[PDB]
Amino acid sequence: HLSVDTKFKTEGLCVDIPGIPKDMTYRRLISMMGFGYPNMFITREEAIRHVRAWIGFDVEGPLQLGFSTGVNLVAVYKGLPWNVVRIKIVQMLSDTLKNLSDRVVFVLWAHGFELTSMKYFVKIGPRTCCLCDRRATCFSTASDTYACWHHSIGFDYVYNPFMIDVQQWGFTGNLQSNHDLYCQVHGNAHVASCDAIMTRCLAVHECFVKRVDWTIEYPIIGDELKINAACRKVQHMVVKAALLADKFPVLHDIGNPKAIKCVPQADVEWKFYDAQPCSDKAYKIEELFFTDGVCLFWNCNVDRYPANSIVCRFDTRVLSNLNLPGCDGGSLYVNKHAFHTPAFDKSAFVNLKQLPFFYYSDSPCESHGPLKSATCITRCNLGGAVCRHHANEYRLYLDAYNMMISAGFSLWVYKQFDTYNLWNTF
Numbered sequence: 001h002l003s004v005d006t007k008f009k010t011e012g013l014c015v016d017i018p019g020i021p022k023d024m025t026y027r028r029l030i031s032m033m034g035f036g037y038p039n040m041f042i043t044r045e046e047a048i049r050h051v052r053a054w055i056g057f058d059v060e061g062p063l064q065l066g067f068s069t070g071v072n073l074v075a076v077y078k079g080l081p082w083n084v085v086r087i088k089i090v091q092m093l094s095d096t097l098k099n100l101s102d103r104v105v106f107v108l109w110a111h112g113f114e115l116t117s118m119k120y121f122v123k124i125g126p127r128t129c130c131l132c133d134r135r136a137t138c139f140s141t142a143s144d145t146y147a148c149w150h151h152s153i154g155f156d157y158v159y160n161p162f163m164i165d166v167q168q169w170g171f172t173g174n175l176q177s178n179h180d181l182y183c184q185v186h187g188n189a190h191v192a193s194c195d196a197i198m199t200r201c202l203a204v205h206e207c208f209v210k211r212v213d214w215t216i217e218y219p220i221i222g223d224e225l226k227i228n229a230a231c232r233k234v235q236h237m238v239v240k241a242a243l244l245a246d247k248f249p250v251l252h253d254i255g256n257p258k259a260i261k262c263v264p265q266a267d268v269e270w271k272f273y274d275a276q277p278c279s280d281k282a283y284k285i286e287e288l289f290f291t292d293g294v295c296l297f298w299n300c301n302v303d304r305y306p307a308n309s310i311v312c313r314f315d316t317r318v319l320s321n322l323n324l325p326g327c328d329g330g331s332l333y334v335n336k337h338a339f340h341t342p343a344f345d346k347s348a349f350v351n352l353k354q355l356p357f358f359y360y361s362d363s364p365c366e367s368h369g370p371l372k373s374a375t376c377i378t379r380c381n382l383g384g385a386v387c388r389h390h391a392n393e394y395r396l397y398l399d400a401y402n403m404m405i406s407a408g409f410s411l412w413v414y415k416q417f418d419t420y421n422l423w424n425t426f
């Protein structure tokens with residue numbers, strides 16, 4: 001954890017707090033703010049481990065409280081006393097975070113009012129939820145009880161929040177000049193939430209775009225495992241069928257250097273090319289480069305795919321608990337590991353078409369241990385009646401396919417791809 005005796009640089013606070021000592025520790029800062037929880041403030045490394053909990057927060061002077069959720073509240077939304085503002089803050093954080101994290105991390109660009117305003121809606125102390133086993137994130141003065149984000153309805157204080165001041169990381173210039181170096185999507189409309197949004201965006205850029213640590217693991221919070229297994233199932237299905245239908249002599253597999261053949265029994269000449277996940281801008285196809293056979297780009301984000309490609313590309317616009325808002329239109333996809341992904345661009349696919357759903361199988365029609373569909377490509381459907389085994393497998397594959405799509409992945413293929421060509425493999 002971050003030692004409370006660590007020095008805190010106070011130059012960013014001195015316009016809101018004139019006269020503040022240059023020599024300052026976290027210990028003295030927390031005291032001046034009026035306050036298993038050794039420090040309210042955390043290290044960059046702890047913050048990165050808890051990116052799902054990040055909420056940018058800015059206060060502008062009555063005071064306008066702005067959050068990276070887009071919300072502005074005025075404490076005296078129009079101005080209201082702190083005793084009702086705090087209730088809204090609890091509800092807002094609880095609904096934003098209950099399916100993401102066991103805590104909140106306020107990401108600051110600290111100039112003073114934000115820190116001195118915390119005592120009006122934060123309480124600290126040593127706890128678990130009164131109604132479950134999750135750690136407590138809220139407190140209620142009405143009942144003198146504690147709750148997690150799931151059981152906090154009607155609570156009035158944030159309990160043991162964490163926080164980090166981006167201005168401690170060693171920047172020159174103000175927030176907007178640093179944020180705008182990397183991102184054109186978030187403006188500065190001069191409301192507190194705009195600053196809150198830029199602050200979080202800059203932190204995401206510093207910690208996941210220019211710096212990358214794929215060794216950090218993140219807890220399971222949703223359908224991660226089913227999604228990942230579906231992606232492997234779809235990858236095998238689509239590539240196997242492409243090879244059967246068009247009989248490419250060579251396949252160029254471009255992407256993760258730890259990739260394995262997804263169709264190990266295919267006859268094709270399989271050649272690998274190493275490219276790590278690009279976290280900043282999509283790769284330029286000119287630099288990466290292939291006109292023989294087919295190219296496979298499985299989550300290898302390029303600016304324009306060649307016409308002879310099979311592509312899986314994550315759609316950064318998808319709304320889900322796994323996909324967090326990112327930098328310059330990118331998104332931070334957190335599924336076991338954290339992957340910042342450049343903004344989705346439909347123009348990357350101009351040479352391709354959307355891959356249609358289909359299910360293909362050459363396995364024997366046998367049930368161990370009634371489906372009608374034009375897209376069940378099997379011997380039994382060719383012959384007029386889908387067998388029970390392929391019926392079961394088709395419905396499982398459909399489920400997997402829909403899971404992958406709903407998670408944000410999109411699939412694209414060379415324009416000549418035609419499932420009609422699979423029927424003659426039977």
Ligand SMILES: C#Cc1nc(CNC(=O)c2cc[nH]n2)cs1
Binds near residue numbers: 074079190192193
């Ligand atoms: C009541 C009331 C108040 N409204 C504001 C407006 N906020 C800003 O102009 C701003 C500047 C930078 N970021 N936001 C401050 S106090």
Ligand SMILES: [Zn+2]
Binds near residue numbers: 131132149150
């Ligand atoms: Zn609970």
Ligand SMILES: [Zn+2]
Binds near residue numbers: 185
């Ligand atoms: Zn931004």
Ligand SMILES: [Zn+2]
Binds near residue numbers: 365378380388390
């Ligand atoms: Zn069958």
